């Protein structure tokens, strides 16, 4: 039984949330923000990611060099990432270096210079990032997947933004973005590891008290996406491995079917030929794929956003003449979530998930990430007892009913990259979303 997550607020509406672990000597403090690329329009798309670069380029007090030195002297590191719906800035340090790290984070968020000289310098760095993501195939596949599934909608945009915007982002629009979005009612100060809650609340009162509040404070994790069944093919015969993602519209964080979608995802599960145990996994798709050498790997996913999600699978394969079999067998396993699953698969997946949801949190950064994610998506940290009860509530009838309305005979978004000549056209893929025998 893990220690209780303590939660306090300031007057501006900044949440402070902490989970102490007296067995570790490091601490992760940081700021989770309920804001990301999805808050940009088409003209300033790329701003949030641009800011993340400039946040480390110097503040009104410390210059770029002083900032570098200050963190080096702390002993730990700082890290940041911007996603579609969430931005994070955190600092891992020693137990007693926590007040320094809170002070540095408060500085780079509130008091960053955003000097025209630095904007102009990063404008080239970010331009080079556009031509080097090209190598991270999983990311290429998932960014095309969002672009097509949410065609011409904010969730469909990339985080980097178009080349055109990178050349035209000004310090004005950067400042406007962080003034509109980085407000106290959208922010959570999180501490995990060797942190005292009462100490962290004091540090928040010292550094984050002059944060603007938004005019209309909605609750944390408050959002209309119209999924497009569609396909992107990026054939490249010179690549040896095909990367394929298939997804349907999934569930939001606060859906009533959130746990049902996780259980369904665990029934298919993951596979990787490089792991020794993977040939012995219980999943039917795992057995088909391993016995027939259809794939190097597959990874089921159920990605959630505030108002939508994507549920699907990501496959990698060198077997270029049997891509058709791989896709066929995968979608016939999805069909069985509608037609065939019983208490056998459901109770096995529940067993595996009851542990999996706890196992994931195995270090201070994972704990901080869990507190921050849950506070910015649900407005509260959900206790493991509540999670165990929501999983236990999932029956085989729930899984069948969910799959029948979410998967069965539904449109998919499909992305293929690499030697995908053997991937059939959209209709033949989408025809495997149902079974004529049922």
């Amino acid at each position: 039984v893990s220690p209780k997550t303590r939660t306090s607020n300031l007057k501006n509406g900044l949440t402070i949330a902490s989970e102490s672990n007296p067995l570790v000597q490091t601490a992760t403090v940081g700021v989770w923000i309920d804001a990301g690329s999805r808050n940009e329009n088409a003209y300033n798309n790329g701003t949030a990611h641009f800011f993340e670069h400039l946040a480390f380029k110097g503040t009104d007090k410390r210059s770029q060099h002083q900032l570098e030195l200050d963190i080096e002297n702390m002993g730990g590191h700082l890290n940041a990432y911007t996603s579609r719906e969430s931005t994070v800035y955190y600092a891992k340090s020693f137990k007693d270096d926590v007040p320094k790290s809170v002070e540095i984070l408060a500085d780079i968020l509130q008091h960053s210079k955003l000097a025209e000289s630095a904007i102009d310098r990063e404008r080239e760095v970010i331009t080079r990032e556009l031509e080097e993501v090209n190598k991270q195939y999983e990311e290429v596949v998932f960014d095309h997947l969002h672009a097509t599934a949410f065609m011409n909608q904010p969730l469909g945009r990339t985080i980097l933004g178009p080349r055109e915007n990178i050349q035209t982002i000004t310090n004005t629009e950067l400042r406007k973005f962080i003034t509109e979005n980085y407000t106290a009612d959208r922010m959570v100060l999180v501490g995990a590891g060797a942190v005292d809650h009462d100490a962290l609340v004091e540090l928040a009162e010292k550094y984050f008290s002059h944060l603007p509040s938004s005019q209309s404070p909605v609750p944390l994790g408050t959002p209309i996406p119209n999924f497009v069944g569609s396909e992107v093919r990026l054939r490249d015969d010179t690549m040896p491995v095909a990367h394929i993602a298939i997804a349907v519209e999934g569930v939001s964080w606060t859906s009533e079917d959130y746990y049902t979608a996780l259980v369904a995802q665990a029934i298919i599960g993951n596979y990787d030929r490089a792991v020794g145990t993977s040939r012995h996994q219980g999943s039917r798709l795992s057995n088909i794929v391993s016995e027939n050498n259809l794939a190097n790997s597959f990874q089921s996913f159920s990605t959630s956003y505030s108002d939508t999600g994507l549920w699907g699978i990501y496959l990698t394969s060198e077997n270029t003449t049997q891509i058709d079999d791989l896709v066929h067998f995968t979608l016939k396993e999805w069909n069985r979530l509608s037609t065939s699953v019983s208490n056998l698969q459901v109770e096995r997946a529940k067993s595996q998930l009851k542990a999996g949801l706890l196992l994931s949190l195995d270090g201070t950064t994972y704990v901080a990430e869990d507190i921050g994610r849950q506070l910015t998506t649900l407005g509260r940290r959900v206790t493991p007892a509540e999670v165990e009860a929501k999983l236990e509530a999932v029956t085989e009838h729930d899984v069948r009913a969910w799959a029948q309305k979410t998967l069965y005979d539904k449109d998919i978004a499909l992305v293929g990259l690499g030697p995908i000549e053997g991937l059939y056209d959209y209709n033949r893929i989408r025809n495997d979303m149902s079974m004529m025998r049922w």
């Binding site: 396909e231 056209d425 959209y426 209709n427």
Partner: protein
């Protein structure tokens, strides 16, 4: 008229069955056009972006 009947006594039945066939076949022709267009639309609508390597 009588001799015409003697040569082709199936005449009346044949033309009524032909009316039924014409109607059914025409409806099936119309539906087959809808279905062909429906199934072909992903191919007809396909778009390309080429970036020369």
């Amino acid at each position: 008229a009588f001799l015409t009947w003697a040569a082709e006594p199936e005449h009346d039945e044949r033309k009524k069955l032909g009316l039924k066939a014409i109607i059914v076949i025409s409806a099936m022709l119309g539906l087959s056009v809808y279905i062909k267009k429906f199934k072909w639309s992903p191919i007809k609508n396909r778009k390309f972006i080429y970036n020369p390597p």
